[PDB]
Amino acid sequence: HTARLVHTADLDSETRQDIRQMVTGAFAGDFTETDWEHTLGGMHALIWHHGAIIAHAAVIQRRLIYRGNALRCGYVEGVAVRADWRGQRLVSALLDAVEQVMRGAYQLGALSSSARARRLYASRGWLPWHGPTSVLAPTGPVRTPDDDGTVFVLPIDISLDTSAELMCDWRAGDVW
Amino acid sequence: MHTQVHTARLVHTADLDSETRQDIRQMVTGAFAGDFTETDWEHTLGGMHALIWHHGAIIAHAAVIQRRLIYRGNALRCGYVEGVAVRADWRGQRLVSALLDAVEQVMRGAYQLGALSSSARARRLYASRGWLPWHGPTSVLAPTGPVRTPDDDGTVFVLPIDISLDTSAELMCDWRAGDVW
């Protein structure tokens, strides 16, 4: 149980489908077409057991604007461990892989965490954002209050004032 | 399995060791006759580097990084091609074709479209492979809101993957430091 990293373009149709179905099941169905689209394009950390995917996390590239700078961010999407495999720290192995990618390629990692996972991210050195969050929408900056309190960041090569504004870039569905 | 000689190899930025990273940076900077800034280098990072090796040196490079391009209010998932370069002593042998086979493979497997802003000398190379010239006005979604990027008009090319785009429409890239396209 060490995770393997595979870019989206290296997944065959069968594997891509196994991943989407496992993740959707792990979120008990609370996983939409846009949530799935948000897991695509970057590196997937995958753990298998007998040809079955039992754990997944994806890290995709985007920009987060902090103090006027568009920081190169590794954004974590779709972190999930199959229900019958929970409580064995498989998530720790997924994050070891995701974090290795962030140290090698990004200025910071970030994600919008489900409440049950917040203790886990904090224990690993992720920081909860306290300042107001926004998104740079096509019409300009728009606050995203529904996502306040869910965003976490992992600084790699920058010290951060986590009470400053933080503004993610645009996409469909949930922007955070 | 043959030797894989001059087949481009795809390596994520996080998997580049410092020696390879330095070799890519100096090779690409030299290929652009030095017109390759600190921000142009930052723009090649975070995605997949297609690398061609010869005697332990990088003789060709192209990076595909992920960003969003906004088309008709839609945020398209885009593989953006940066730093396309073939070291000067190896030019004229179609190695850029080997780089683009890998780049295009990445687009079909992971993005809604590939895009890039081409130097004038390479516009015909991309067009011959099926990349479409973007005819409409380009802009960027800067922190203050949309703003036109006329200097970049006529340089952008796209490779749609199973989506249909009206290439005469406005196309707006997302924000970053330096050249936004």
Ligand SMILES: CC(C)(COP(=O)(O)OP(=O)(O)OC[C@H]1O[C@@H](n2cnc3c(N)ncnc32)[C@H](O)[C@@H]1OP(=O)(O)O)[C@@H](O)C(=O)NCCC(=O)NCCS
């Ligand atoms: C959050 C999640 C990835 C954790 O994966 P994991 O590998 O099971 O994590 P851990 O083993 O460290 O367990 C985390 C907690 O889950 C709980 N847990 C233990 N066994 C469990 C089980 N059999 N079923 C469900 N939850 C269980 C415990 O509270 C545990 O905390 P502890 O370390 O103090 O015991 C997983 O629960 C999951 O996929 N949940 C649904 C999707 C989700 O919210 N993903 C996160 C999005 S940010």
Ligand SMILES: CC(C)(COP(=O)(O)OP(=O)(O)OC[C@H]1O[C@@H](n2cnc3c(N)ncnc32)[C@H](O)[C@@H]1OP(=O)(O)O)[C@@H](O)C(=O)NCCC(=O)NCCS
């Ligand atoms: C653009 C580039 C990647 C093409 O690489 P390549 O593998 O040499 O491509 P090709 O073999 O198909 O040659 C392209 C053209 O370059 C020209 N060429 C041939 N030999 C050349 C040489 N030794 N030196 C420079 N240009 C040469 C020819 O016009 C050739 O076209 P042709 O096949 O119709 O005769 C390369 O010229 C380069 O790195 N240029 C500098 C950086 C830059 O502009 N890159 C593109 C950024 S979008």
Ligand SMILES: NC[C@H]1O[C@H](O[C@H]2[C@H](O[C@@H]3O[C@H](CO)[C@@H](O)[C@H]3O)[C@@H](O)[C@H](N)C[C@@H]2N)[C@H](N)[C@@H](O)[C@@H]1O
């Ligand atoms: N519902 C699937 C999504 O869940 C998590 O992300 C969301 C996050 O968690 C989901 O919401 C449920 C209630 O907290 C929680 O139970 C979550 O369902 C949510 O609180 C934020 N407001 C928006 C985040 N995008 C994951 N980080 C995200 O990758 C995934 O696509």
Ligand SMILES: NC[C@H]1O[C@H](O[C@H]2[C@H](O[C@@H]3O[C@H](CO)[C@@H](O)[C@H]3O)[C@@H](O)[C@H](N)C[C@@H]2N)[C@H](N)[C@@H](O)[C@@H]1O
């Ligand atoms: N100067 C280095 C950059 O060049 C190419 O891209 C630029 C592109 O080409 C550079 O400009 C020279 C003249 O066209 C050409 O000689 C080019 O120098 C330029 O025309 C666009 N206005 C902006 C593009 N970012 C590459 N696509 C880009 O990846 C690289 O970072």
Ligand SMILES: Nc1ncnc2c1ncn2[C@@H]1O[C@H](COP(=O)(O)OP(=O)(O)O)[C@@H](OP(=O)(O)O)[C@H]1O
């Ligand atoms: N009325 C409720 N019934 C059941 N669970 C709820 C209720 N309202 C909110 N929740 C859940 O309880 C959590 C509430 O989220 P909050 O962001 O308010 O954080 P909190 O638990 O630290 O107070 C969520 O769990 P999840 O993110 O792990 O999925 C949310 O789903």
